[PDB]
Structure 1
Amino acid sequence: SHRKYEAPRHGHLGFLPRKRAASIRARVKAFPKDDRSKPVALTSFLGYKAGMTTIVRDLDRPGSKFHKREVVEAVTVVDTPPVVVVGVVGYVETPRGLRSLTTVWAEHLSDEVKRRFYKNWYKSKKKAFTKYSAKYAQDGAGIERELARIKKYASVVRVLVHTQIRKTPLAQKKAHLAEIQLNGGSISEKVDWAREHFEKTVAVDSVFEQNEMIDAIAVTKGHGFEGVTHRWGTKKLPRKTHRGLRKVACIGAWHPAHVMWSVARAGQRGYHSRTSINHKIYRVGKGDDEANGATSFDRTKKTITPMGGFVHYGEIKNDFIMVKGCIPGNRKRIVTLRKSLYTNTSRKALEEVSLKWIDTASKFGKGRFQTPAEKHAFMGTLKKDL
Structure 2
Amino acid sequence: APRHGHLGFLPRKRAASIRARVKAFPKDDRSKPVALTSFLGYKAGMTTIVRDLDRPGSKFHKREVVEAVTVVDTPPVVVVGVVGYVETPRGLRSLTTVWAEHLSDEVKRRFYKNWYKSKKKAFTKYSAKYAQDGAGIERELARIKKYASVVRVLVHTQIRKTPLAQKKAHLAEIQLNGGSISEKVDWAREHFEKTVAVDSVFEQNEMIDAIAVTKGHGFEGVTHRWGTKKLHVMWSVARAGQRGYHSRTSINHKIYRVGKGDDEANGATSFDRTKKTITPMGGFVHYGEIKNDFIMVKGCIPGNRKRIVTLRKSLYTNTSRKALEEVSLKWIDTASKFGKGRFQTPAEKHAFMGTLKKDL
TM range (shorter): over 0.9
Structure 1 residues 40-80: Cα deviation after superposition (integer angstroms, max 9, x where no partner)? 12100011000110011111212222210110000000110
Contact 2:158-2:169 within 8 A present in 1 as well: yes
Distance 1:174 1:204 in 2: 20
Q: Deviations over 1:317-339 (max 9, x none)?
A: 11111111100000011110111
* Contact persistence 2:53–2:328 (CA under 8 A): no
| Alignment deviations for residues 89-142 of structure 1 (CA, whole Å, 9 cap, x no partner) | 000111100111100111000101111111100101100100001011322201
Which segments of 5 or more consecutive residues in structure 1 lack a partner in the other structure?
Answer: 1-6, 237-257
Other-structure match for 2:271: 297
* CA distance in structure 2 between the aligned counterparts of 1:223 and 1:118, rounded to whole angstroms: 30
Return structure 1 stretches of 4+ with deviation > 4 angstroms: none
Question: For the Cα contact (< 8 Å) 2:79–2:192, is it kept in 1?
Answer: yes
| 1:136 aligned partner | 130
SS in 2 for 1:302: coil
| Deviations 1:294-346, CA, capped at 9 Å, x for gaps | 01111100001010111000100111111111000000111101111111131
Task: Write out per-residue CA displacement over residues 187-226 of structure 1, whole angstroms, 9 at most, x where no aligned residue.
Answer: 0000001111111111111100111111101001111111
SS, match of residue 176 in structure 1: coil
- 1:11-49 CA-to-partner distances (Å, cap 9, x unmatched) read 111111110001111001101121011111210001100
Is the partner of 1:13 in helix, strand or coil?
Answer: coil
**Alpha-carbon deviation of 1:146?**
1.0
CA distance in 2, matches of 1:316, 1:14: 36
Q: How far has the Cα of 1:382 moved from its partner? A: 1.1
Preserved CA contact (<8 Å) 2:50 2:64? yes
- Cα distance in structure 1, aligned partners of 2:42 and 2:15: 18
CA distance in 2, matches of 1:218, 1:373: 38
| 2:152 partner SS | strand
TM-superposition CA deviations, 1:151-205 (whole Å, max 9, x none)? 0101110000001111111111000000000111110000001111111111111
Mapped partners of 1:43, 1:211: distance in 2: 17
Question: How far 1:350 moved relative to its partner?
Answer: 0.9
1:227 corresponds, among 211, 221, 229, to 221
SS in 2 for 1:206: coil
Q: Which has the larger radius of gyration?
A: 1
Uncovered stretches (5+) of structure 2, i.e. residues with no partner? none
What's the TM-score, normalizing by structure 2?
A: 0.98
Within 1, Cα distance between the matches of 2:141 and 2:304?
A: 40
Q: Distance in 1 between matches of 2:6 and 2:342?
A: 41
Give runs of aligned pairs for residues 314-333 of structure 1, distance below 5 A. 314-333=288-307
Instruction: Provide, for residues 274-303 of structure 1, a one-character-per-residue CA deviation record: whole Å limited to 9, x for no partner.
Output: 011110111000011210000111110000
SS at match of 2:85: strand
Question: What RMSD in Å do the two structures reach over aligned CA positions?
Answer: 0.8
SS in 2 for 1:216: strand
Identical positions, percent: 100
Aligned equivalents of 2:296, 2:138: Cα separation in 1? 40
